[PDB]
Amino acid sequence: QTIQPGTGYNNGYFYSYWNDGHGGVTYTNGPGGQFSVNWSNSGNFVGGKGWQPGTKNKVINFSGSYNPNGNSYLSVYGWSRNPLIEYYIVENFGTYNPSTGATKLGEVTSDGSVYDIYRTQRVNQPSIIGTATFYQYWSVRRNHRSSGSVNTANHFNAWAQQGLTLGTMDYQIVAVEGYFSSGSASITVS
């Protein structure tokens, strides 16, 4: 249904929808692993469906439509604890490459494309454990797509070869994220 921000379970899948207070985002849970998001002149938000907790060898499928108009990502998206890490395997994005300004560490080939790997740092920012300083890990897919399958282990293994280690997993979703933009998406996870 159309829901306000929160987390929970819907039709067998964990979901998370967070919105920074700017309005303009309509997040809807659908049947099965489906969710949709339609946004207009948003702030920053993140929404999607998956698992709580994720795993270090899940193969994640996604399909549907993704039509951002500006700064937006479509990603496998999640966290670990001890260490505290927010990670992204970015399958598609809008006008802003999330790695802009970041230092590249390497490349991994998976599911039909090369990805570029990066590490960034969030300082005193919101997190799954409250205000915190933590690293973010990125794999950015060169061949943008809105449906496919992601072998998460390929990314976690490449990241580890760059000294980027993960802790105990927290949630693991396919997320649409927007940052002060407009768009539509309708995505089914499995």
Ligand SMILES: O=C(O)c1cccc(C(=O)O)n1
């Ligand atoms: O009344 C509201 O502000 C409302 C209602 C449904 C969704 C949302 C939202 O996603 O912010 N907000």
Ligand SMILES: O=C(O)c1cccc(C(=O)O)n1
């Ligand atoms: O309950 C709500 O309506 C809500 C909560 C957080 C952010 C937003 C929003 O950005 O409208 N709305």
Ligand SMILES: O=C(O)c1cccc(C(=O)O)n1
């Ligand atoms: O206070 C709110 O959450 C609010 C106010 C205006 C629009 C919206 C919305 O788009 O959710 N939300």
Ligand SMILES: [Eu+2]
């Ligand atoms: Eu609202």
Ligand SMILES: [Eu+2]
């Ligand atoms: Eu080649």
Ligand SMILES: [Eu+2]
């Ligand atoms: Eu908060």
